[PDB]
Write a protein that binds this ligand. Structure first.
Ligand SMILES: [Zn+2]
Length: 182
């Protein structure tokens, strides 16, 4: 089995401009590509796990999401970062788009996406890390037995409740390799 870094996307990998779904509005956060490259070198699988309820809302389409996600995967590959998995949840129970209007067990704080990655990549969850900017990320992590729960400061303001549920709070994903080393 392998340890992993589970990664939210908006606010962790890219700047959260609100419902980001276009290549020209996708901005990698400073230092995160270098950090991802270092985390792979430290033995970790890298798995994106993202809630994308804007699809259920009709803020943008699944086609727009797929297009951006393919672009993002190639962009990282071209910079020597080969993501091991990419998981997303397009659902919302109040969704306007019928196809995605539902309750599910993949919408964080539900651990579904992390459990699916666990089984697909044979992940050692106790040895793994979840990195995000929201309470729901930390709650999905505790449910999935992720050993270390990490908040970053590059996304949504950290709430006391998110802080409570986290083990570590870092400035950004760029700080994670050094924090693990230490
Ligand atoms: Zn879902």
């Amino acid at each position: 089995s392998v340890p992993a870094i589970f990664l939210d996307r908006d606010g962790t990998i890219n700047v959260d401009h609100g419902y980001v779904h276009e290549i020209d509005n996708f901005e990698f956060i400073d230092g995160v590509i270098d950090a991802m490259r270092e985390l792979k070198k430290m033995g970790f699988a890298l798995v994106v796990v993202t809630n994308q309820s804007g699809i259920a809302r009709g803020k943008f389409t699944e086609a727009q999401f797929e297009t951006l996600t393919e672009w993002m995967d190639w962009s990282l590959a071209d910079r020597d970062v080969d993501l091991d998995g990419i998981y997303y949840c397009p659902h919302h129970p109040q969704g306007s788009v019928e196809e995605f209007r539902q309750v599910c067990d993949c919408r964080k704080p539900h651990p579904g996406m992390l459990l699916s990655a666990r089984d697909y990549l044979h992940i050692d969850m106790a040895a793994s890390y979840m990195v995000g900017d929201k309470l729901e990320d930390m709650q999905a992590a505790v449910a999935a037995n992720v050993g270390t729960k990490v908040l970053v400061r590059t996304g949504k303001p950290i709430t006391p409740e998110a802080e409570n549920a986290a083990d570590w709070v870092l400035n950004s994903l760029a700080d994670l390799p050094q924090a693990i080393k230490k």
